Design a protein around this ligand. Structure first.
Ligand code: CDL
Ligand code: CDL
Ligand code: PC1
Ligand code: PC1
Ligand code: PC1
Ligand code: PC1
Ligand code: LPP
Lengths: 713, 505, 72, 54, 62, 96, 62
């Protein structure tokens, strides 16, 4: 009973068995059918020699025969089926199968072991295999199951356990998404995956659970996931020292996965599922402060609007199913043109089928994008914690309508109602949100109304009909809105949950990183000259159509909304950071104590600063990649699957003098507004006269500098 | 590859499960009657009440397992019977296979058993809902009402004969037998004092419809002397007779399956009845009426416009949905939800034997399970918090997290999320109604799924959320294992029944 | 920054300020099995995945893979 | 932060605690409701696996 | 709520559920779970339960 | 109310008799009499009230055996449907 | 048989009581307690599956 002796005997037996296998294989090759003539020779000496020298083969065959006999008995017992092929007795069967050695003819122990070892070898995996089969599904399922199981098992996973588990899952998901983003956007790669036959929806119909990873899906998915990764990293610092941080983290993960499922939906049933899931998870995030009933009122407002949108979407899907006996998104997109000519007989009116379907879709899209009239819930949804607010308002909850329009664009291209309604409502919402945000005094409310304005601009861009411009606008707005939301969240946490900047002043020194990060993020968000966010508005005005009947109102509202960005950006930044100290004495004194002076001193989190920095860097890189893909001379974007060409790119490639000078009007309007917000004095100061003098110096120097640059050189 | 062995196994299982239940009930009753001079509980650990509870529970459960097996056998049998009829096209060949009865047990009431998918769905609902309700009524049965431990076994036997009979008179008698046990339960087991009047309202309101159905049955039997339920193919009712029969049948069965304006009794009984018996009532006892209406109206040929009946059903749905908001009582709110779902189900049966019946059956199953879930949640709230009123109950989630989570997931399921038989049934009904009358479909969907849904969600969310600062010495602990697993099983069924074979749906 | 910590009843199974000593092993035994489950789901679903042709490939209209209309 | 307290020293950091359900861990009653529901779940799952799956 | 602990894991629980007070009978506290789905008392297999006291007294009496 | 017997014979109740001690000397003329039973419940160490504390493999084995039986039963059913004693595995399988 | 065996074996008391009883349970007694209910239920389900599965058809060929 020695382990060393057992191992040595096992190794010796392995070598003997391998040698016997090789010998039998060679002899079998030589004597395919005549091997028995020598193996089973009647000679006693030869029989004994063969048995002794092939004992490992014989014992292995005996064990295999016993195992096969027992397995066949078990199968017969369980299935009440047949016999062991034949009714051979136990003795006859075992003797025959043990004497038979042909089972080893193609078997080599070393080769088999090597195959088993190399089966798990990871060197083999290649990009080509990944390109053939998408690993995005494997990582998304990982993230989903991690979130679900973490929700269920909270006691097992403490604060740190939940954070680390979900961080690993989300990082893997984001890296895979990043890998496939390059292929889908430019290389014309898209996948249609099916998990199975989900449900039966008619007498003989059964819809499968399918996902569509296309350019339209990936544009939203990658943006949401990239924003969510850094929001997740930031939340652990924002909700620092809170009773319930795991709950908030898991709610954020749930909302992210719900939005990902919605955007990457293969059929209307999955789309509706994702729609309801984002609604429910947004409700939970808004109602996070469950103890308070004041929060429940805002949550219930959002819930009612979401249920109305669900009604509209469900009715539209029912109309589509009744018309075409199909719920597949691709099939519907490629079939809708045939049924365009059809009408539906309703109560007393014959409504055009496309018009009614597009009416319901646009209604639900407006409700979820917080357009004018249906936006009443968005200002009240700010009761959620800042990470949840950023995620919902950047690219997750308020872009659902934009995703719907982009995915079902072939439908709306043949919609008279869409043509009339999208530009008017978009421009009105843009103007309303911009002006209200400019006049707003609270940080979260300002960001919410700015989000409403940018959603209006997105609607107007879709009305223009350049899906590339819409996608660029969506990406820019989402990234920079999220970054600004994180910055204001740090500011609010420092200011002790007081979100109004009337009590904020001189925070530049107390939050140095937030000041500069907010400066960059706001100049990019509010379309300002010489910034990454100027081109989105420039392209929107390039593509704006002029055949509308309400074009005067549409254009005036668009101009006012576009200019409104400057006021809110300036007010937010200046009032928060560089205005006179208006906050309570405690806020400043508690942090100005000399004892706190240390290398570790900070009023924010190092992880939060790093998360914001990485978010800004990645947003810049991705926006540049999209700009190169679309706005470059060589068009390298993937197919959008739309046959409607707007001609808008003509005024981007070869603009005429008329349009070039027309854009200057808005440019100079913005310039005058900047001069007003900078040099305008509302309060007496020691620097009133010197401020007027500086304005005079700037005007005269600008004139002379222009003279020298243009003429004197 | 289908063989006669499967046919006979199906028939034998169906026939013998009934006798299994009957013998269990007979033995339990004999023990109960002959063990004590007076049939009341002896307040000690050695009472026969424990044995009777054990026998009832694990007779229902084992019969439910056998019913699963027999239902699967029936599905295979019906599918292969349809294949046998449909496949062969040669004129000389015809499927005429005759089966000989067993010599072990007799045919109850000298009737040959006939089973249908709707009947077996109804029987499965009976089993499951009866199991839940019996599990609920343990705290109610005490020392003088222990005789009502057999009420659900009696219900199971009645429903078994109801769904496994091809005789019109036996069908009607089984339908009418359900009144006595239910009335006795409400009268003797209900804690509240208003249950005494609620029971009388229930009896009178249901008996008016029972009399209407009795008049219809008398019209059918007196005119057609047949009772086989299939000889009606060779007899045609005139227009006047047919319209009278359909009106009587619809009104009579709508008295039981609540329709506007005949739901006053339902609201009263649900509010004032035992929390464990409300589950059984709403889940099952209102669907025997739907099954009977389906059978009678599909057997009779009707040449009348069903617009009036559709309008009645839609008015009931609208009325219940609009009233949902104004209820601070959770039990009454769930009762209004039951009225809404039952009216939708009844509307699903207004086009004769069209494909609407499939959606109606699926919606009946999902409503049974959903109503059981909702009434069980209300029962848990009332039993641990000694009140079922929104003003007195607030912040359930923060003291009983599992109960609050159950409420939230119940609301999500009630909303009709995809992946649930609730969503599937809504899809069936609305897809049909869109082509039948699109504007009516829009109005029905709008009302039910927005206004009624918001009214329903307001009270439940207000109860779940908030801050329970009142009576801190009397706050409960949490759900028990029994309650938690009942809730989990309801969720599991609502989710997984969507994978049932689509052949019958 | 955060709210002041207050006592939580022992009998109540709530998540207020819950930290687990064995969170490392808990995460280890909750991550890898989930990864294996997702791998199984992924390999099951890949059988029913569709991808368009590659850069240098064209679909022959008469090949079986090409779409076929219903023949009455 | 300035005056953060470690978990090992913070007296109000909670380790996992609480009773999962209302059932008494040490109960002398031969109660069978939990066993009945577990049996129902298991038999339903087994029926699905052995009669319906595939 | 902090004191509340019906089970004995955190706050020790007497086998005698409560401490009787003078001028009151000794009654068991109402359990948190009051389910009546209880079997008859279970005993070990082949449990010895012969009336040994009566047998011994009868043997002594003769 | 509950009528079951507390003193079961299937096993001995875990208990600790040292937490509470009964006074037996030094009484006064105004002090109440001590208590006779002072045993408290003692839980097994490493018992976690927040989970099931289930350490058996019976459920896992039952589920795995059910799944394996379902797999083999489906294999046999497919062979019967194809009219063969066993599955005829093809040389190549494509997506579908 | 399976239902009753499962109920009576797993309905002895609380978690602690059941665990201690099973720990004191002998090896063979533990084996039967674990295996009886599963074997009975599984045999019933297998007998049910056998009828629907018509394997004993003589046309198996090719
Ligand atoms: C407190 C509850 C309150 C409830 C009431 C309130 C309800 C409403 C509110 C809800 C929210 C509040 C409650 C939640 C918090 C609870 C807190 C708590 O109690 O913590 C302790 C609790 C238990 O853990 P523990 O106390 O530490 O230890 C328990 C024992 O040690 C474990 O012992 P063991 O290791 O021996 O495990 C025993 C067994 C567990 O035994 C059982 O649970 C018996 C189940 C019998 C069948 C019943 C139907 C099952 C339907 C599917 C769902 C499976 C159960 C998972 C839970 C539901 C989903 C989340 O484990 C398994 O073997 C799992 C496999 C189960 C598969 C059975 C499938 C049957 C057929 C189904 C239909 C056909 C499917 C075809 C699929 C085809 C291929 C895709 O915390 C958890 O562990 C949570 C687990 C959550 C589920 C995930 C893990 C299982 C995954 C199974 C496979 C599916 C995943 C993907 C597979 C992909 C490949 C196929
Ligand atoms: C959006 C809504 C979301 C809602 C959900 C949110 C998330 C909720 C999360 C929290 C709740 C769920 C997750 C946690 C559940 C609890 C898990 C747990 O561990 O609890 C511990 C829990 C409590 O532990 P305990 O107090 O110790 O109780 C132990 C049990 O009484 C019994 O334990 P045991 O150790 O005594 O094991 C007993 C076992 C005994 O196990 C065995 O016997 C297996 C080993 C022997 C194999 C046979 C060998 C024969 C030859 C002898 C060989 C030598 C001996 C070998 C054995 C040696 C000993 C090991 O017997 C059985 O299981 C009988 C089943 C038989 C029928 C089914 C299986 C067979 C199918 C057919 C097979 C055909 C082929 C085979 C043929 C065989 C020949 C005829 O115990 C269990 O896990 C019991 C299972 C049921 C637990 C509850 C399950 C609830 C599931 C809820 C699902 C809800 C789904 C909602 C979906 C919604 C979607 C929208
Ligand atoms: C008539 C010519 C055709 C054009 C028609 C339109 C005329 C111009 C209309 C401009 C409306 C701007 C509204 C901004 C509201 C900002 C509100 C806010 O945030 O608080 C005040 C913030 C300051 O916020 P604050 O926080 O620093 O202090 C606020 C102090 N209280 C509250 C006391 C007022 O910004 C301003 O004060 C600047 C706005 C006032 C000055 C407006 C000058 C307009 C110059 C127009 C130039 C036109 C150029 C020619 C071409 C135009 C057409 C292409
Ligand atoms: C002409 C013929 C007439 C036949 C009449 C039938 C007479 C029925 C008499 C019932 C007596 C019940 C008490 C028996 C003594 C129990 C002793 C005990 O508890 O020790 C534990 C012992 C053994 O326990 P165990 O620990 O070995 O657990 C395993 C249990 N078995 C053996 C069943 C697998 O006895 C029992 O557990 C038996 C329980 C009996 C009660 C069952 C209740 C469920 C419903 C069935 C009741 C009977 C109705 C008929 C069958 C159903 C319909 C087909
Ligand atoms: C809703 C009321 C409150 C709730 C209680 C419910 C009470 C009413 C229940 C429904 C009764 C049937 C009403 C619809 C009848 C439709 C057919 C019809 O009459 O059209 C003329 C019919 C149909 O005619 P037709 O024009 O279609 O075709 C035949 C034409 N001729 C004959 C000329 C060839 O004509 C008749 O033959 C007259 C029949 C009149 C029958 C009226 C009495 C019915 C008595 C039995 C039921 C009594 C129930 C009482 C319950 C207790 C009340 C308190
Ligand atoms: C086979 C494939 C995989 C199978 C897995 C099936 C999973 C089915 C769904 C499981 C849901 C589990 C929910 C657990 C909730 C636990 C309690 C909790 O979180 O705290 C409650 C919190 C606080 O709980 P607490 O802290 O008081 O108590 C926690 C401990 N207990 C409950 C045990 C006492 O209360 C609330 O405010 C309610 C919040 C509910 C939030 C629910 C969000 C769910 C989001 C899921 C997103 C999934 C996306 C899917 C995308 C694909 C769709 C096709
Ligand atoms: C560019 C992506 C960047 C992000 C990647 C994140 C990680 C993704 C997960 C790893 C890849 C999995 C898909 C493999 C595809 C494939 O089969 O690729 C094919 C190769 C073999 O090549 P061939 O099939 O072409 O011959 O597969 C293998 O070699 C299998 C070996 C295992 C691979 C990893 C399995 C991960 C799942 C969990 C394992 C848990 C182990 C036990 C823990 C206790």
């Amino acid at each position: 009973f020695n382990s060393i002796l057992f191992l040595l005997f096992f190794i010796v037996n392995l070598y003997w068995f391998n040698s016997g296998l090789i010998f039998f294989n060679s002899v079998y090759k030589i004597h395919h059918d005549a091997w028995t003539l020598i193996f089973q020779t009647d000679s006693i000496l030869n029989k004994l020699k063969i048995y002794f020298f092939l004992l490992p083969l014989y014992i292995s065959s005996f064990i295999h025969s016993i195992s096969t006999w027992y397995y066949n008995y078990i199968l017969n017992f369980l299935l009440f089926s047949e016999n062991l092929n034949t009714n051979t007795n136990f003795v006859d069967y075992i003797t025959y199968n043990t004497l038979l050695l042909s089972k080893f003819e193609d078997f080599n122990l070393f080769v088999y072991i090597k195959t088993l070892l190399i089966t798990f070898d990871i060197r083999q995996i290649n990009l080509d295999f990944l390109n053939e089969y998408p690993i995005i599904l494997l990582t998304g399922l990982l993230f989903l199951f991690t979130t679900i199981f973490s929700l269920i098992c909270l006691s097992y996973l403490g604060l740190y356990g939940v954070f680390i588990l979900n961080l690993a899952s989300i990082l893997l998901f984001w890296l895979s998404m990043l890998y496939y983003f390059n292929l889908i956007v430019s290389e014309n790669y898209y996948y249609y995956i099916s998990l199975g036959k989900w449900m039966y929806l008619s007498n003989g119909f059964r819809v499968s659970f399918d996902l569509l990873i296309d350019l339209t899906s990936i544009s939203f998915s990658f943006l949401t996931l990239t924003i969510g990764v850094f929001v997740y990293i930031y939340t652990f610092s924002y909700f620092r020292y809170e009773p319930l941080v795991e709950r908030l983290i898991l709610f954020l993960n749930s909302f992210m996965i719900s939005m990902i499922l919605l955007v990457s939906s293969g059929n209307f049933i999955v789309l509706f599922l994702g729609w309801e899931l984002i609604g429910l998870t947004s409700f939970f995030l808004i109602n996070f402060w469950s103890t308070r009933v004041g929060t429940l009122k805002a949550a219930f407002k959002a819930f009612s609007f979401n249920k109305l949108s669900d009604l509209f979407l469900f009715f539209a899907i029912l109309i589509i199913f009744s018309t075409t006996y199909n719920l597949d998104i691709l099939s519907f997109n490629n079939q809708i043109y045939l049924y365009e000519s059809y009408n539906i007989d309703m109560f007393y009116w014959s409504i055009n089928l496309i018009e009614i379907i597009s009416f319901f879709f646009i209604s639900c899209a407006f409700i979820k994008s917080a357009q004018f009239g249906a936006h009443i819930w968005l200002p009240d949804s700010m009761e959620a914690p800042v990470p949840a607010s950023a995620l919902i308002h950047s690219a997750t909850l308020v872009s659902a309508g934009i995703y719907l329009l982009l995915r079902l664009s072939p439908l709306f291209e043949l919609s008279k109602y869409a043509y009339f309604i999208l530009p008017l409502i978009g421009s009105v919402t843009a103007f309303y949100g911009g002006l209200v945000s400019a006049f707003q005094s609270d940080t979260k409310k300002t960001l919410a109304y700015s989000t409403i304005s940018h959603c209006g601009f997105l609607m107007v861009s879709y009305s223009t009909g350049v899906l590339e411009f819409v996608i660029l606008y969506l990406y820019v707005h989402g990234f920079f809105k999220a970054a600004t939301f994180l910055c204001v969240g740090n500011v609010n946490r420092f200011n002790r949950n007081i979100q109004d900047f009337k009590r904020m002043g001189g925070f530049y020194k107390y939050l140095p990183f937030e000041c500069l990060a907010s400066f960059v993020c706001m100049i990019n968000l509010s379309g300002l000259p010489l910034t990454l966010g100027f081109y989105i508005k420039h392209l929107l005005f390039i593509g704006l159509v002029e055949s509308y009947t309400l074009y005067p109102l549409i254009f005036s509202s668009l101009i006012l909304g576009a200019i409104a960005g400057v006021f809110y950006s300036y007010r937010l930044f200046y009032s928060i950071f560089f205005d006179t100290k208006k906050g309570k004495k405690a806020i400043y004194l508690q942090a100005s104590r000399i004892i706190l002076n240390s290398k570790f001193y900070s009023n924010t989190s190092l992880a939060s600063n790093l998360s914001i920095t990485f978010l800004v860097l990645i947003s810049y890189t991705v926006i540049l990649y999209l700009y190169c893909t679309t706005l470059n001379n060589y068009y390298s974007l993937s197919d959008l699957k739309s046959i409607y060409i707007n001609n808008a790119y003509s005024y981007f490639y070869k603009p005429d003098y008329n349009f070039l000078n027309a854009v200057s009007i808005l440019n100079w309007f913005v310039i005058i507004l900047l001069i007003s917000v900078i040099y305008l004095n509302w309060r007496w100061s020691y620097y009133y006269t010197k401020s007027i003098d500086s304005l005079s110096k700037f005007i005269l120097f600008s004139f002379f500098f222009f003279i020298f640059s243009k003429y004197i050189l | 590859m289908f063989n006669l062995n499967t046919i006979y196994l199906s028939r034998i299982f169906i026939e013998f499960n009934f006798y299994f239940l009957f013998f269990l009930f007979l033995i339990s009753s004999i023990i109960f009657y002959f063990s004590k001079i007076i049939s009341i509980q002896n307040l000690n650990q050695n009472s026969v009440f424990n044995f009777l509870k054990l026998a009832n529970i694990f007779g229902i459960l084992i019969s439910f397992f056998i019913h699963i097996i027999s239902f699967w056998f029936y599905c295979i049998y019906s599918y292969n019977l349809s294949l046998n009829i449909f496949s062969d096209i040669n004129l000389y060949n015809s499927n005429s296979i005759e089966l000989l009865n067993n010599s072990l047990l007799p045919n109850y009431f000298k009737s040959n058993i006939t089973i249908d998918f709707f009947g077996l769905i109804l029987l499965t609902l009976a089993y499951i809902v009866g199991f839940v309700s019996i599990l609920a009524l343990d705290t109610r049965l005490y020392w003088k009402n222990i005789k009502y431990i057999f009420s659900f076994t009696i219900f199971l036997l009645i429903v078994y004969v109801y769904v496994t009979v091809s005789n019109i008179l036996l069908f009607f008698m089984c339908y009418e037998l359900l009144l006595i046990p239910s009335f006795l339960i409400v009268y003797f087991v209900s804690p509240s004092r208003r249950a005494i009047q609620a029971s009388l309202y229930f009896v009178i309101w249901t008996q008016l419809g029972s009399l209407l159905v009795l008049i219809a049955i008398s019209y059918i039997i007196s005119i057609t002397n047949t009772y086989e339920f299939n000889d009606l193919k060779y007899f045609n009712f005139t227009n006047s007779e047919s319209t009278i029969i359909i009106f009587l049948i619809f009104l009579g069965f709508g008295f039981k399956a609540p329709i506007w304006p005949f739901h006053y009794w339902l609201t009263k009984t649900h509010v004032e009845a035992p929390s464990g018996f409300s589950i059984y009532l709403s889940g099952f006892l209102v669907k025997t009426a739907l099954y009977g209406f389906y059978k009678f109206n599909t057997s009779i040929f009707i040449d009348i416009d069903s617009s009036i009946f559709i309008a009645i059903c839609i008015m009931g749905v609208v009325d219940s949905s609009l009233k949902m908001w104004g209820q601070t009582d959770l039990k009454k709110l769930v009762a209004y939800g039951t009225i809404q779902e039952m009216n939708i189900i009844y509307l699903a049966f207004c086009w004769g034997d069209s494909c609407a019946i499939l959606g109606g059956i699926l919606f009946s199953a999902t409503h049974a399970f959903l109503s059981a879930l909702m009434f069980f949640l209300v029962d848990c709230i009332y039993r641990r918090y000694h009140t079922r009123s929104l003003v007195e109950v607030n912040g359930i989630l923060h003291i009983t997290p599992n109960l609050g989570l159950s409420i939230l997931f119940m609301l999500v399921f009630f909303s009709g999320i995809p992946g649930t038989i609730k969503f599937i049934s809504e899809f069936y009904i609305f897809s049909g109604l869109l082509e039948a009358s699109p504007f009516i479909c829009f109005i029905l969907m709008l009302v039910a799924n927005v206004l009624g849904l918001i009214g329903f969600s307001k009270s439940w969310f207000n109860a779940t959320f908030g801050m329970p600062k009142k009576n801190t010495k009397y706050l409960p602990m949490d759900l028990s294992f029994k309650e938690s697993y009942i809730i989990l099983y309801c969720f599991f069924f609502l989710f997984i029944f969507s994978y049932f074979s689509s052949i019958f749906f | 920054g955060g709210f002041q910590k207050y006592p939580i009843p022992r009998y109540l199974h709530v998540g207020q300020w819950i930290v687990n000593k064995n969170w490392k092993w808990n995460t280890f035994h909750m991550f890898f099995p989930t990864a294996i489950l997702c791998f199984m789901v992924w390999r099951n679903s890949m059988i029913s995945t569709a991808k368009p042709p590659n850069y240098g490939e064209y679909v022959d209209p008469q090949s079986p893979v090409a779409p076929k209309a219903i023949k009455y | 932060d300035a005056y953060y307290h470690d978990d090992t020293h913070e007296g109000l950091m909670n380790e996992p605690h609480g009773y999962l359900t209302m059932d008494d861990p040490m109960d002398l009653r031969p109660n069978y409701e939990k066993s009945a529901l577990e049996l129902l779940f298991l038999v339903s799952g087994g029926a699905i696996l052995a009669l319906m799956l595939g | 709520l902090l004191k509340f602990d019906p089970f004995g894991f955190y706050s020790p629980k007497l086998l005698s559920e409560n401490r009787p007070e003078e001028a009151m009978p000794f009654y068991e506290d109402y359990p948190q779970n009051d389910s009546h789905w209880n079997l008859w008392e279970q005993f070990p297999e082949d449990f010895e339960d012969s009336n040994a006291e009566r047998e011994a007294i009868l043997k002594s009496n003769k | 109310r509950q009528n079951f017997a507390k003193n079961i014979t299937t096993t001995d109740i875990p208990k600790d008799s040292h937490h509470f001690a009964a006074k037996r000397s030094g009484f006064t003329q105004t002090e109440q009499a001590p208590f006779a039973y002072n045993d408290v419940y003692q839980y097994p160490k490493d018992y976690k009230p927040w989970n099931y504390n289930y350490k058996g493999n019976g459920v896992l084995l039952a589920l795995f055996l059910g799944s394996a039986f379902s797999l083999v039963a489906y294999e046999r059913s497919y062979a019967s449907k194809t009219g063969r004693y066993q599955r005829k595995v093809q040389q190549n399988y494509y997506q579908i | 048989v399976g239902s009753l065996s499962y109920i009576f074996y797993n309905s002895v008391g609380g978690k602690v009581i059941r665990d201690r009883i099973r720990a004191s349970r002998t090896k063979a007694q533990k084996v039967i307690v674990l295996a009886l209910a599963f074997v009975a239920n599984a045999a019933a389900l297998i007998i049910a599956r056998n009828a629907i599965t018509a394997h004993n058809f003589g046309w198996q060929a090719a």
